[PDB]
Structure 1
Amino acid sequence: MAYYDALTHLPNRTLFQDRLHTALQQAERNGQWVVLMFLDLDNDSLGHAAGDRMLQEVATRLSACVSQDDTVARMGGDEFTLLLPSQGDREIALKRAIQVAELILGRLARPFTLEGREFFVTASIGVALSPQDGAELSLLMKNADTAMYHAKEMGKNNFQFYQAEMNARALERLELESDLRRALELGEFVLHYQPQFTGDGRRLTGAEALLRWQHPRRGLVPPSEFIPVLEEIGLVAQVGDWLLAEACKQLRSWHKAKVRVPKVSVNLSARQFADGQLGERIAAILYETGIPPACLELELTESILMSDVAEAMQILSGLKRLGLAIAVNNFGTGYSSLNYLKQFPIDVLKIDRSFVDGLPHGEQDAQIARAIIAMAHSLNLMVIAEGVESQAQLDFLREHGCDEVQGYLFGRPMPAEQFGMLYAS
């Protein structure tokens, strides 16, 4: 009438089925996703302590690999199973499965000492995802077992998803994460510049710096592809640091040659905003280049400000103490969330394109914008809109008081030289 495994203190086929079924019904109601993992480890001879003892160690390792709502179990022999339930969507479930899989492989890569000597262990994993690889327990298990057998016949110390989609995906992510790793050391990062104009569109008020990746096989990569991954792994600080140096050194270069760009706007991410050396670095750059901090505008999202308000207060304070302007961006609206930015030392409000896309044919968008502009004005903030495509948008914005503007109606982002030439005087 057993419920768990004696040897490993891990649940057993009966309970992992009850919890899998349970999590599947749960995922069926709450419309969520479920990660099922099958693990095979690869007693003789002379091995019956190792089988007893190795299995235990592997179970200890497996437990320390996945989250508590998650479940590690054993289904006889060398074979273990994992359950990662309550996943929001296919994306985060895929990612979670990846992380769990390759940590397990790295854990099990660790030596085992049993009968006084070291021994290594191979493990092959197959991963199936509900409700896609099966809305049902037995089907999902058949398919996870299948994926494990493919992973197995393919080699040792590897994992494979049931769907080829996920494998190709994972591989691509690995390639991206590796090439990204080389890029900065190599020097494959270049800065493009989209210019900012007055609400009317006459005089130039600045230049937004945009990070670009000049990959010699992929040419220039789409930021939407590499920027997330870049920030997802701890690389976004050194790069962001090079960036800053380059942008300041450009403004200074620009001003001293053929171009008057009164300021440059650089956007920051979660990590490099919370990077404790941001001030020591920015002050050092501002020092070396020789440009007034007012000519450097830093840009943030609300998601970044409101993730940790208490921290944001201190970083933003320490940054304003330099003399530079703070810009804030994107999501709402959601108006006294304007109230919420009142509590900060901000100088600039920046309207995301998702608001301008409805201008001025979408009346709600037209009026929502108009609200944003007025209330941002009330807090003495500068308002600039992004994604100005048509004259119909530009006209509206200028006729309603949007101080600055930027977008594609004025052209595409470009290198610094061509920038300095396209707005030389």
Structure 2
Amino acid sequence: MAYYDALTHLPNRTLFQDRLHTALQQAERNGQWVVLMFLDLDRFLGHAAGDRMLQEVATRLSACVSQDDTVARMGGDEFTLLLPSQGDREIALKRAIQVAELILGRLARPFTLEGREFFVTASIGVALSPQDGAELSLLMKNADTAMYHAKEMGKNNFQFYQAEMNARALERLELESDLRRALELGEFVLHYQPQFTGDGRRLTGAEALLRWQHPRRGLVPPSEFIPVLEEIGLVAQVGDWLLAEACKQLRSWHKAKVRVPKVSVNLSARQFADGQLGERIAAILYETGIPPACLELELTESILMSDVAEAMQILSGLKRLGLAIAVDDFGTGYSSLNYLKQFPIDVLKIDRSFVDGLPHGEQDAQIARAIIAMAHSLNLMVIAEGVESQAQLDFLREHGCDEVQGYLFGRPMPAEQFGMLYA
């Protein structure tokens, strides 16, 4: 079409502007964000090889974005990208960071024409609608301004139009950098929180809890760095380290006459979706010599109930491995009672938020009784988390809560102190 660049087959300037306008009008109607990127090359060649290079650039750019994103060619050495329908500021910001890093990484790679090797460098400017403009020409002014800022900083850079996003981008990249290194140097450590029978007479297991100690940031809370791990391929690899470390710990504790009956590991949504999950778990159980009965997986009702049919199969695979399954944070999500019984699950965990109102919050008291009753109706065992007070414990015990966990019974703890404190 007259609307496409004859060489790269990408939309031309006018078509791209129409789609940008459309994306802006729609975003504004749905309270969504749009990312606009401008990209310039210094190249860095031959005439025919030149046009062949632009073609390779184009291919590489298309490969960095999804189905719904547009890549286009403004002219000469300038390309633009459009990432529409981003749910909010932060999704937009992360997706922009991710796409821009991906692009610079792909364009770093050498261009192999005439048998030989060439390099190009790129400068990228990024502007996010609506904040940097909800109108196409303002959004473009600002992406272009960011681009030139990116140039004024040297080779292979991306800048946002907002300084605040540039700062946040730089830090995010450093965090990612540190987390890769954390795994390489082993800066992660496992702490264990003990689990008891409702009376407190007895230790039923330990919940393993990832911590991260960085020399400068100090100790980073799991809630900060875990989501970052899963936003890369890092989490499966960290999960492997963790599972193996807990299995080894179990080994040492048994050797040292510390009778810990089992250990619980939390799983993210990403780990749960992984096709090799059960395979990697079996692999680790085999290396460490520990049986599946010693292990329990903890998944949130949001992870299980989003796609119930898929979850049924994944869970069934894991049970055939002989391991137990607990539904973490229970009561904070949306659950089919139907599938709660069909899923081969073992345990419900009463979220801390409900335990916190005990014993004199009517709402929290009734919700907690209800969970216990559900659990026992489905032959599930339930443990209350976040038990911090004698009164909470009295209530839960009085109403048949099977197991209990919380600061009242001692904080999360490194393995050796754990053994001594609960031997």
Alpha-carbon distance in structure 1 between the residues aligned to 2:321 and 2:83:
47
Q: CA deviation at 1:33?
A: 0.5
Whether contact under 8 Å (1:384, 1:406) holds in the other structure is yes
| 3-state secondary structure, aligned to 2:330 | coil
Q: CA deviation at 1:415?
A: 0.9
- CA deviation vs aligned residue, 1:183-218 (integer Å, no higher than 9, x gap): 333222221011112334443322111122233333
Q: Which moved more, 1:386-395 or 1:376-385?
A: 386-395
- CA deviation vs aligned residue, 1:320-345 (integer Å, no higher than 9, x gap): 34543221223556676232121122
Whether contact under 8 Å (1:348, 1:383) holds in the other structure is yes
Q: CA deviation at 1:62?
A: 2.5
Matches within 5 A, 1:32-111: 32-42=32-42, 48-49=47-48, 52-111=51-110
Alpha-carbon distance in structure 1 between the residues aligned to 2:300 and 2:32:
28
Q: CA deviation at 1:346?
A: 1.5
* 1:418–1:78 CA distance, 2 compared to 1 (3 A): same
Whether contact under 8 Å (1:199, 1:404) holds in the other structure is yes
* 1:357–1:165 CA distance, 2 compared to 1 (3 A): farther
* 1:319–1:95 CA distance, 2 compared to 1 (3 A): same
Whether contact under 8 Å (1:338, 1:376) holds in the other structure is no
Q: Which moved more, 1:326-335 or 1:152-161?
A: 326-335
* 1:7–1:13 CA distance, 2 compared to 1 (3 A): same
Q: CA deviation at 1:414?
A: 1.3
- CA deviation vs aligned residue, 1:218-272 (integer Å, no higher than 9, x gap): 3432111222222332233343333223323333433453643332222233454
* 1:263–1:103 CA distance, 2 compared to 1 (3 A): closer
Whether contact under 8 Å (2:348, 2:381) holds in the other structure is yes
Q: Which moved more, 1:1-10 or 1:239-248?
A: 1-10
- CA deviation vs aligned residue, 1:279-305 (integer Å, no higher than 9, x gap): 565556556666554332222223433
Partner of 1:24: 24
Structure 1 length as normaliser, TM-score?
0.86
Whether contact under 8 Å (2:332, 2:351) holds in the other structure is no
* 1:163–1:358 CA distance, 2 compared to 1 (3 A): farther
* 1:110–1:378 CA distance, 2 compared to 1 (3 A): same
Partner of 2:221: 222
Alpha-carbon distance in structure 1 between the residues aligned to 2:248 and 2:56:
55
Q: CA deviation at 1:150?
A: 0.9
Whether contact under 8 Å (1:272, 1:278) holds in the other structure is yes
Alpha-carbon distance in structure 2 between the residues aligned to 1:212 and 1:336:
30
* 1:139–1:215 CA distance, 2 compared to 1 (3 A): same
Alpha-carbon distance in structure 2 between the residues aligned to 1:107 and 1:291:
43
| 3-state secondary structure, aligned to 1:258 | coil
Gaps of 5+ in 2: none
* 1:335–1:25 CA distance, 2 compared to 1 (3 A): closer
- CA deviation vs aligned residue, 1:81-111 (integer Å, no higher than 9, x gap): 1111100112221121122212222333344
Whether contact under 8 Å (2:3, 2:14) holds in the other structure is yes
Alpha-carbon distance in structure 1 between the residues aligned to 2:272 and 2:3:
49
Alpha-carbon distance in structure 2 between the residues aligned to 1:4 and 1:289:
58
Whether contact under 8 Å (1:49, 1:114) holds in the other structure is no
Alpha-carbon distance in structure 1 between the residues aligned to 2:205 and 2:310:
28
* 1:206–1:54 CA distance, 2 compared to 1 (3 A): closer
- CA deviation vs aligned residue, 1:37-69 (integer Å, no higher than 9, x gap): 1111219xx755455444344333323332232
- CA deviation vs aligned residue, 1:90-140 (integer Å, no higher than 9, x gap): 222112112221222233334446677644322210001111222332222
Q: Which moved more, 1:233-242 or 1:375-384?
A: 233-242
* 1:279–1:110 CA distance, 2 compared to 1 (3 A): closer
* 1:195–1:38 CA distance, 2 compared to 1 (3 A): same
* 1:244–1:132 CA distance, 2 compared to 1 (3 A): same
Q: Which moved more, 1:111-120 or 1:207-216?
A: 111-120
Q: CA deviation at 1:157?
A: 1.9
Whether contact under 8 Å (2:301, 2:334) holds in the other structure is no
- CA deviation vs aligned residue, 1:13-39 (integer Å, no higher than 9, x gap): 333232222211211111100001111
* 1:113–1:348 CA distance, 2 compared to 1 (3 A): closer
Whether contact under 8 Å (1:350, 1:384) holds in the other structure is yes
Gaps of 5+ in 1: none
Whether contact under 8 Å (1:349, 1:382) holds in the other structure is yes
Q: CA deviation at 1:382?
A: 0.7
| 3-state secondary structure, aligned to 1:346 | coil
Q: CA deviation at 1:348?
A: 1.0
Q: Which moved more, 1:350-359 or 1:376-385?
A: 350-359
* 1:144–1:303 CA distance, 2 compared to 1 (3 A): same
* 1:362–1:12 CA distance, 2 compared to 1 (3 A): farther
Q: Which moved more, 1:50-59 or 1:297-306?
A: 50-59
Percent identical: 99
* 1:126–1:347 CA distance, 2 compared to 1 (3 A): same
Alpha-carbon distance in structure 2 between the residues aligned to 1:391 and 1:99:
48
* 1:397–1:276 CA distance, 2 compared to 1 (3 A): same
| 3-state secondary structure, aligned to 1:339 | helix
Whether contact under 8 Å (2:351, 2:384) holds in the other structure is yes
Partner of 1:4: 4
Whether contact under 8 Å (2:39, 2:122) holds in the other structure is yes
Alpha-carbon distance in structure 1 between the residues aligned to 2:111 and 2:293:
59
Q: Which moved more, 1:265-274 or 1:286-295?
A: 286-295
Whether contact under 8 Å (2:250, 2:260) holds in the other structure is yes
